[PDB]
Amino acid sequence: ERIRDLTSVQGVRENSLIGYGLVVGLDGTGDQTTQTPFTTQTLNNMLSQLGITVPTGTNMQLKNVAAVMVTASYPPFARQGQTIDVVVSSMGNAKSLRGGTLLMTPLKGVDSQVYALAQGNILVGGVNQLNGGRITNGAIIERELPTQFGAGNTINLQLNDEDFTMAQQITDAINRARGYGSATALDARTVQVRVPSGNSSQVRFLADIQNMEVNVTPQDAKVVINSRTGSVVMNREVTLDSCAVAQGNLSVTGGSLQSVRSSANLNSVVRALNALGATPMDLMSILQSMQSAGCLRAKLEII
Amino acid sequence: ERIRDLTSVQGVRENSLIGYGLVVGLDGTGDQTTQTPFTTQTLNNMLSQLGITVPTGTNMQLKNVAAVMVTASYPPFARQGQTIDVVVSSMGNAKSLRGGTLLMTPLKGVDSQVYALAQGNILVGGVNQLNGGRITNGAIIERELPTQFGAGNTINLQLNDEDFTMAQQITDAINRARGYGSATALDARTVQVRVPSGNSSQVRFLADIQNMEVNVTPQDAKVVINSRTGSVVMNREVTLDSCAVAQGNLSVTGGSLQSVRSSANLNSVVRALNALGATPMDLMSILQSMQSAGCLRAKLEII
Amino acid sequence: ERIRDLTSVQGVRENSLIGYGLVVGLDGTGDQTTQTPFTTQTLNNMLSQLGITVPTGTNMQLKNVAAVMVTASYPPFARQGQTIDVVVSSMGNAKSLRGGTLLMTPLKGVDSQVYALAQGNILVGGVNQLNGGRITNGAIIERELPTQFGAGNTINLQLNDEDFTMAQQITDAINRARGYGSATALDARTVQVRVPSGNSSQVRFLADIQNMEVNVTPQDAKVVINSRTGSVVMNREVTLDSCAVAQGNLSVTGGSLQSVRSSANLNSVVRALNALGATPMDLMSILQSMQSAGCLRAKLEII
Amino acid sequence: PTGTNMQLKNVAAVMVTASYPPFARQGQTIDVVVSSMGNAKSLRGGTLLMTPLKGVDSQVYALAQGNILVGG
Amino acid sequence: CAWIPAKPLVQGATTAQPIPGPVPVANGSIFQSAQPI
Amino acid sequence: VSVTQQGQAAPVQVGQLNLTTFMNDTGLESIGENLYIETQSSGAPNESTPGL
């Protein structure tokens, strides 16, 4: 059950759907409608569609209606009649969408075609975000996408992370499990697999391939630094080289220059860095300086 | 597993993608839209695309919408349908993006072509940055880049750091592992490797090469000084020469002139510099003066 | 491993790259944009490139955008696809760049050609500088420089410090290690080395030469005085001549005239100068007066 | 545009001085001194942009760019 | 009178074409200087 | 708001000055310099064209 966790099947992908709607039933926490003319304009549009023509010159000050944007994911092999979850986000000067209801909303694709219709009740946590909510099974699929699955005798497994070693390992595992020339590698990210012609046979082949177990070879050493959240993460391949480190208000537990020993595994690296007595914000600067000097034998990525 | 940590494969590189978008669902912490006309202009553009035409003369004062810039990395051998992480950064006078949602955003390359589409929910730490966030698997790849991998019988390993000794060591290791004329050195940074013609064979060759172990020869002595963060880092090759040092409010633990002994290894250097009793900010000036005089037998780099 | 620390190889040099960019995602600590018109002008340029045309007459008051200058180093034998670190510095009236993101920035050379593209997240220490930051692997190399390495049978080792004795020592070491006429001296700074024609052979020759050990002969006596930082550094070759010294508020530990004995080594000099009981700021004037008189048998350099 | 008010706070105009060593060769690096020229308060964490270093004959002999170290 | 040929005050060509720059040297430096005067 | 331009024989419309009406006017909070902030006792500012 590792191949399904390391790769994705070519043609089996997700799309993004967007749409505009109105959320009603709020407890006076909707749009002001004086700074958001589109709310009243679209409410008048809906009323006109339903058979009510409000005169153009009239002041409408609503409190229970909010103009919202609805986002959804079009799943692979989606069929009409199926339901998907949607996210509803306020667009202007609304205060809360706690007990609102989303009216009929057409969800358009990139090609500006309706692929789903959204309508349901919003669930809002209520420190919690008030202007955003989620509706489970809130949209019904209305259009279906053609696909080439089942045509041809080749399917590509696309690795989540590029690696020649992992691509070769997956290819060798498939060849060890299902014949000599069952899988070949095209690059560091794509493995081409030969499958029998048809739909059911390819589904069977993919079902056998997906749950296969592949031992993950060691990746590249990498230290991920998030300055916006104040976090540091080091994987198991990080090593250290011996060198001296000095930083403000940090001293030997003594002098301001502290030795850092040569470290081979991650436990040694953690011990050496904890001997410094550094706050993670200080550890960020220490790690960047050590990468500049050359002690840190890892790829420092700031995210 | 050291060659993969010391070099990069020619043609296996990452690109940078940029785009503009709108983030909705904020709790009154969005753009003021009076000092940022582009937010309202692009919201009107989106509404017009969706079928709603707000009259040109109208005052729109939103609070839950922020105009943002989205940045992403195009991975090597990227295939359409694959997902990548994106970074979302506010552009003007917005207060927070804590619970926002990124709408459909096309990510352009340097050639101003769409290579990915971004849409998802932002994660913001919440001392923490409020105007910046990250969306994991927030963008789907839409375009693929042609490449020459698998063509020809030559591939170049490019060292992260230039070194004739390390280039020769990598060449000798490859020749010791995979035949006489398997690898040759072109300069201090590039090692040319002969591979069989084809795609699968080159993937196999790179998989064997990448995890090979190479003993790292000693680099150049280097002292990295970061005055903006107040840090000093010295690698294992730094030595010291005997000389006298004087600085304000520093004295023998006595006279203001303190002797610094000749030091061969890093432990001796650390001991000699800690005998001075110098704060790291004082140590920066001391090290610069010693480099000017000639005691410091290392390359002093200010970063 | 001393020749690599004493010399540099001809043609193996570093260049400097500069560029202009915008940093977004700040927490209200960006440019005021009223005193920095170029920030808004370049933001409008970027938006126009992305497809958004903000009308010329409009007031844009941003808070999360700062105009920055990006500096980088082009390494020797740089290849496209490789990543380098960049420094990001604010240009006008910005308050902080703590959690900012650098957008697509072309790094130009002296010839005003793009050699790299910079984009990433800034790391700022946070007494610490707030308007300056560093991005590790923040720029990808896009252009490559032609070079003459591997052509001809001559390569010049350039000493960091000019010295006839050190040049002769390096020449003699190379001749002792790799044949009779392998290296010759051209001046006090340059040593010419004969290498076989080709690329791999010269890399092998330089790999053998670089890690060679050379005993450093004694340099010129030198006393470095930094009045801006208040430091004095004396190397091991400094000697003293016997003479009397008088200075304000300094007396025999008695009379204001104190004898300074003739000193041969550095320990004797340090002892004689510490017997004076002089503050380093007083020691600066004392040393300058002694150099004028002739007691100080060293070169006094003010840095 | 020529008519515009620019009031900066993070930029200082500076003069850079350096020593050309004996037998200097292109590609070699030297130390430089950076000194403020008018009404600036500090250069503690500044960065020097691309600066051509001229000789007495008004010819470029070096290019200066780096991070300044100030005692403080 | 106005048809009599005359020599203008500013004789010769009134424009100059830029000369293409010298070929850069293969030394590993971006800075390339024209032949100094 | 209309502005006359030289040569042009017709005023050019620039913008509408809208007046804000409150349902409880006494409950506004006086900031000082001739300005009032909305208050929970004087909520819902209604922006309307003057005269209606």
Tokens at C131, concatenated = 């308007």
Contact yes or no for D27 and E29 at CB 8 A: yes
What CA–CA distance (Å, rounded) separates C13 from A214?
Answer: 46
Chain E hits for D59, CB-CB cut-off 8 Å, are: 36
Contact yes or no for D71 and C229 at CB 8 A: yes
Beta bridge partners of B285: none
Q: What's chain C's Rg over C-alpha atoms?
A: 28
Strands C222-226 and C231-234: antiparallel
Query: Out of B12, B35, B38, whose CB is closest to C61?
Result: B35
Query: Out of C11, C91, C303, whose CB is closest to D11?
Result: C91
Chains meeting C at 3+ CB pairs closer than 8 A? A, B, D, E
Residue B132: its H or E element: strand B132-141
Contact yes or no for C110 and E26 at CB 8 A: no
Find out whether B170 and B157 touch, Cβ atoms under 8 Å. yes
Selected for mutation to probe chain B from D34, D69, D70 (highest B CB count within 10 Å) is: D69
Find out whether C219 and C168 touch, Cβ atoms under 8 Å. no
Beta bridge partners of C90: C68
Cα–chain-centroid distance for residue B90? 21
Please tell me what DSSP assigns to residue A123.
B
Q: Mind spelling out the 3-state secondary structure of chain C? A: CCHHHHEEECCCCCEEEEEEEEEECCCCCCCCCCCCHHHHHHHHHHHHHHCCCCCCCCCCCCCCEEEEEEEEEECCCCCCCCEEEEEEEECCCCCCCCCCEEEEEEEECCCCCEEEEEEEECECCCCCCCCEEEEEEEEEECCCCCCCCCCCCEEEEEECCCCHHHHHHHHHHHHHHHCCCCEEECCCCEEEEECCCCCHHHHHHHHHHHCCCCCCCCCCCEEEEECCCCEEEECCCCEECCEEECCCCCCCCCCCCEEECCECCHHHHHHHHHCCCCCHHHHHHHHHHHHHHCCEECEEEEC
In terms of Cβ atoms closer than 10 Å to its own Cβ (0-12, 13-18, 19+), residue C303 is middle
Chain F hits for A35, CB-CB cut-off 8 Å, are: 47
Contact yes or no for B76 and A188 at CB 8 A: yes
Contact yes or no for A302 and C136 at CB 8 A: yes
Instruction: Give me the phi and psi of C43, to 5 degrees please.
Output: -65, -40
Question: Residues of A numbered 261-290 whose beta carbons fall under 8 angstroms of chain B's beta carbons: which are they?
Answer: 262, 285-286, 288-290
Residue E11: its H or E element: none
Chain C hits for B13, CB-CB cut-off 8 Å, are: 80-81, 140
Chain D hits for C71, CB-CB cut-off 8 Å, are: 47, 49, 65
Q: What phi-psi label fits residue B294: left (phi over 0), alpha (psi between -120 and 50 degrees) or beta?
A: left
Chain C hits for B19, CB-CB cut-off 8 Å, are: 50
Selected for mutation to probe chain A from B80, B203, B284 (highest A CB count within 10 Å) is: B203
- Residue entry with tokens 């310099």: F33
Tokens at C234, concatenated = 């004396």
Chain C hits for E30, CB-CB cut-off 8 Å, are: 15, 74, 109-111, 113, 115, 145
Which residue from F minimizes the CA distance to A57?
Answer: F52
Chain D hits for E33, CB-CB cut-off 8 Å, are: 60
Instruction: Give me the phi and psi of B220, to 5 degrees please.
Output: -80, 140
What CA–CA distance (Å, rounded) separates C122 from C130?
Answer: 11
List, in order, residues 6 or more apart from C197 with CB less than 8 Å away.
C152, C153
Question: Residues of D numbered 2-61 whose beta carbons fall under 8 angstroms of chain B's beta carbons: which are they?
Answer: 31, 44-45
- Nearest 5 degrees, angle CA B126-CA B129-CA B132? 105
What CA–CA distance (Å, rounded) separates A263 from B5?
Answer: 16
Chain F hits for A63, CB-CB cut-off 8 Å, are: 44
Please tell me what DSSP assigns to residue A27.
S
Distance from CA of A157 to the nearest CA of B (A): 10
CA distances from C205 to B25, B165, C11, C153, C198 (A): 64, 10, 15, 11, 11
Selected for mutation to probe chain F from A31, A32, A34 (highest F CB count within 10 Å) is: A34
CA distances from C105 to A143, C43, C239 (A): 42, 13, 54
List, in order, residues 6 or more apart from A110 with CB less than 8 Å away.
A15, A16, B104, B117
Task: Evaluate whether chains F and A are touching (3 or more beta carbon pairs less than 8 Å apart).
Answer: yes
How crowded is residue E33: how many other Cβ atoms within 10 Å of its Cβ? 11
Chain B hits for A257, CB-CB cut-off 8 Å, are: 232, 234, 270, 273-274, 283
Selected for mutation to probe chain F from A33, A58, A59, A93 (highest F CB count within 10 Å) is: A59
Number of C-alpha atoms within 13 angstroms, CB side, residue C80? Answer: 9
Q: Is the dihedral of CA A33, A36, A41, A42 positive or negative?
A: negative
How crowded is residue A289: how many other Cβ atoms within 10 Å of its Cβ? 24
What CA–CA distance (Å, rounded) separates B137 from B140?
Answer: 7
What CA–CA distance (Å, rounded) separates A166 from A155?
Answer: 18
- Nearest 5 degrees, angle CA C180-CA C185-CA C188? 150
- B120 three-state secondary structure: strand
Contact yes or no for A242 and B65 at CB 8 A: no
Contact yes or no for C200 and B184 at CB 8 A: yes
Tokens at C241, concatenated = 């001549």
Instruction: Give me the phi and psi of B164, to 5 degrees please.
Output: -65, -40
Which residue from B minimizes the CA distance to D29?
Answer: B299
Number of C-alpha atoms within 13 angstroms, CB side, residue D9? Answer: 12
Tell which residue, C63, C71, C65, has the closest CA to residue C132. C71
Chain B hits for D66, CB-CB cut-off 8 Å, are: 302
Query: Out of D45, D67, D72, whose CB is closest to B281?
Result: D72
Strands C243-245 and B83-90: unpaired
Instruction: Give me the phi and psi of A64, to 5 degrees please.
Output: -110, 15
Residue B20: its H or E element: strand B15-24
Tokens at B43, concatenated = 């919201």
Distance from CA of F35 to the nearest CA of A (A): 20
At residue F8, what is the residue type? Q
At residue D11, what is the residue type? V
Tokens at A239, concatenated = 């090593």
At residue A113, what is the residue type? Q
Method: cryo-EM
Distance from CA of D9 to the nearest CA of E (A): 31
List, in order, residues 6 or more apart from C22 with CB less than 8 Å away.
C39, C42, C43, C46, C65, C66, C67, C68, C102, C103
- A207 three-state secondary structure: helix
Tell which residue, C154, C258, C157, C162, has the closest CA to residue C209. C157
Distance from CA of A60 to the nearest CA of F (A): 10
Note whether C200 contacts D: Cβ–Cβ < 8 A. Answer: no
Find out whether B249 and C235 touch, Cβ atoms under 8 Å. no
Tell which residue, B229, B247, B302, B243, has the closest CA to residue B272. B243
Chain A hits for B61, CB-CB cut-off 8 Å, are: 35-36, 92-93
Residues on chain E bordering chain D, Cβ-to-Cβ distance under 8 angstroms? 27-29, 31, 33, 36
Q: What's chain B's Rg over C-alpha atoms?
A: 28
What CA–CA distance (Å, rounded) separates A300 from A226?
Answer: 11
List, in order, residues 6 or more apart from C283 with CB less than 8 Å away.
B246, B256, B257, C232, C273, C276
Which residue from C minimizes the CA distance to A285?
Answer: C125
Q: What's chain F's Rg over C-alpha atoms?
A: 17
Please tell me what DSSP assigns to residue B218.
P
Tell which residue, B187, C170, B220, has the closest CA to residue E28. B187
Chain E hits for C107, CB-CB cut-off 8 Å, are: none
